[PDB]
Design a protein around this ligand. Sequence first.
Ligand SMILES: Nc1ncnc2c1ncn2[C@@H]1O[C@H](COP(=O)(O)OP(=O)(O)O)[C@@H](O)[C@H]1O
Ligand SMILES: Nc1ncnc2c1ncn2[C@@H]1O[C@H](COP(=O)(O)OP(=O)(O)O)[C@@H](O)[C@H]1O
Lengths: 134, 742
Amino acid sequence: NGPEIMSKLAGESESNLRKAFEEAEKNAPAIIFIDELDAIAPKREKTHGEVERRIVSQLLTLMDGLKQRAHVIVMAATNRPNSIDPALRRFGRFDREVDIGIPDATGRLEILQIHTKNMKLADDVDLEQVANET
Amino acid sequence: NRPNRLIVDEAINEDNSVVSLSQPKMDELQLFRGDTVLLKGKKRREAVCIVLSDDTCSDEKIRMNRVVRNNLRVRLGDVISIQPCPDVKYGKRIHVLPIDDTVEGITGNLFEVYLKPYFLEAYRPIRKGDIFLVRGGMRAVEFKVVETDPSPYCIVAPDTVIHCEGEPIKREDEEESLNEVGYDDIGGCRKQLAQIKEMVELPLRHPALFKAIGVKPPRGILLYGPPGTGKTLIARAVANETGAFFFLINGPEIMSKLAGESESNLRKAFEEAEKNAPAIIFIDELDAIAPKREKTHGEVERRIVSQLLTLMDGLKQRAHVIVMAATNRPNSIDPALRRFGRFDREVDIGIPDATGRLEILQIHTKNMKLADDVDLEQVANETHGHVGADLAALCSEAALQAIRKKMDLIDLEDETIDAEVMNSLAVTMDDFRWALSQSNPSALRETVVEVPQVTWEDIGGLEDVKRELQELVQYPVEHPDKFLKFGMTPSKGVLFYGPPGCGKTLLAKAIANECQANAISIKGPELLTMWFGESEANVREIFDKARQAAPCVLFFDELDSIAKARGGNIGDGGGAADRVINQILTEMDGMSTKKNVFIIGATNRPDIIDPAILRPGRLDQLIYIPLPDEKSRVAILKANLRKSPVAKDVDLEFLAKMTNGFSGADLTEICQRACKLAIRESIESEIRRERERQTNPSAMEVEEDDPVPEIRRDHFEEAMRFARRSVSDNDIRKYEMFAQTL
Ligand SMILES: Nc1ncnc2c1ncn2[C@@H]1O[C@H](COP(=O)(O)OP(=O)(O)O)[C@@H](O)[C@H]1O
Ligand SMILES: Nc1ncnc2c1ncn2[C@@H]1O[C@H](COP(=O)(O)OP(=O)(O)O)[C@@H](O)[C@H]1O
């Protein structure tokens, strides 16, 4: 979690990051997930603290090292591709990008079905209209 | 003086145990190509190889590759001996063994598949100690001759036995790893690699010579280019091809620490490089360490920049260490480094061409299997905007596209996948097309400098302008001295004025193709983008690129676009000046003649162009491009139709005579319309044919005939209905008036 790293000091933060990477490597084949990546590594124009720039380089070194060792895979979640640094979007760190976009009427209907399983419904539901109106 | 020894050089023939020398030195050695010859080298080792001769190679150069050099303990520029080997013997069982960690993760009867086809029909002259190599099934493995039943060297008989056993062993520290790179592992950077090699071959192969003369070598080099182009790869290849010690530094690894650790690591790096002289230092992501002071706020950043400057200054006094740095653009970093003594020498890598992309594909397709359908020429043509890594990824992706569902399901239960089934799979072009269309994150949109392919034959007629053009460009370079004898100074600019669609853009590239020089083209939308964005500084960059790509040609079209934007031809109240042409004139006037950078402009409304750009100097010469005539229209039609299949009932001269006041594009559009009609007719006919007989359950009904492989006068005469004039006669009268009032 991004904030959990930003809510500490340099030593603790850059020890937890490394320790997480070692733990992921030890339990291979494993997966690492990161969210709120913007909170950690935005473009340098928005960064002023020296510690903030000292926390991005560590991540780049770890990503470069990953290629040599183990089967670990890394996945990150962001709001928009341009919100983060362009140095991560290179060959060997975050080459692959994917979009989730937004569900359609069929997707909304499916989500309603998922969320209405254990619930009891009457005969007047007609979820199609709700999906159209949603 | 004893022409026994000889110099080393690259090898063209990739087959091992093979060489290539010049034609004349046959009696100089008294032997033929088929003759087998032993070749000497240090640590008291000599290897046998077959012979062959070429012509392009000088009489003083041997041709040989990485593996033979490895089993001879040699590098380029060195020298060895030679002696023919008519005393060869046909060797029976000669025990071998696969000696590497390449073994790791292998299975199957590699013996047969890998070796029997290699030694097949080979008669490979083999001598003990050889470390010969072979590639197959996405991998590349090597074997060493441990014993030769007859010794030391022997022919291999297609009948000789190979009872192949033994387990992997270790490579002594003497020889290096197969993975180590070389000049043969890169393509598309032939010009740059030549510059670097010629620049840094003396200080490392001949340092005592530098100590013997008073001259200042370079002790700092900068390379700029987009990411994924092969800069660190080039550095490591150069280091491996000379034996000089190599050391690496990573920008983030320094910024991921505190001041003391960072500024201790840098000093220790420099000290180790000095102690291991002759050595090379490489730095990447230099912008991450030393950007311009405007972007730095932390004091420690300035401290590390100052430390780097001081260490660069201190390098000059001590040792033979060389420093190389990699960046994206020259202006991204501080200007204090670009001085005399720190980073004086600079280099561009740019982008590979179709040939370079083809070479990269060949490099990355060695171990991978392939099929007949696959051709690397068409793929290179459809891979614009791809640099290095991209292609590699593509390759891998394509391979997986074949493996994933078919092989996984088959092997899931049948048996633990072995080498035989693993390498049995080939690759198909449909897989390449899938990997190309689906995964096409082209990573580049910047300008491209390269030699075009258009030729005079592509253009129709216009011979006199060809003669007038060769004089302005060819004669200077072919015969510079002639001008010195007289008092002439060649002009550097020309301007084309005329109606649209008359091949003005084609000449600028035909000239470059004839002269084999780089070409750059900037379109009007870019000029308007700079005008609205009020960014005239970019102009300078363009010229710098041309300055570094000389000899080259510069092209500007839609030069009247700005004048048309602000008001009509007369314009608004303002005059005929603007913010961009002023910068262009400022750059042109302050340019040297010896750089050989020609300038071409093009337009169709010279009336409103600023006169200041046509004064003696600058763009003094003007040429008029008229509408194609009958004899030119036939040539244009033939040139446009030399690519598509056509019938013979056509009468091209009849159509050309029928056309008057037409443009070159006015005929290409007719060709495309007729081709579209043919495609539509074929589609409808084929779909109807497939649909009709499906109801009729005839298991076999194949009257297979190309419904319309070629087009007739019907489609063309249909197309002439929509084919009409484009340029008004009044416009031609205006052009002639402007061409006569001069
Ligand atoms: N000219 C080239 N020929 C072959 N491979 C290349 C070339 N340029 C880049 N590559 C590929 O790029 C990868 C290395 O990228 P690198 O050169 O480190 O990126 P950068 O240019 O940003 O330093 C290698 O795996 C290599 O296969
Ligand atoms: N002399 C010519 N011979 C063959 N094709 C021509 C000729 N002139 C124009 N064309 C056609 O016109 C197109 C290029 O148009 P161009 O003449 O560059 O326009 P502009 O004059 O605005 O630069 C090409 O596709 C080409 O087929």
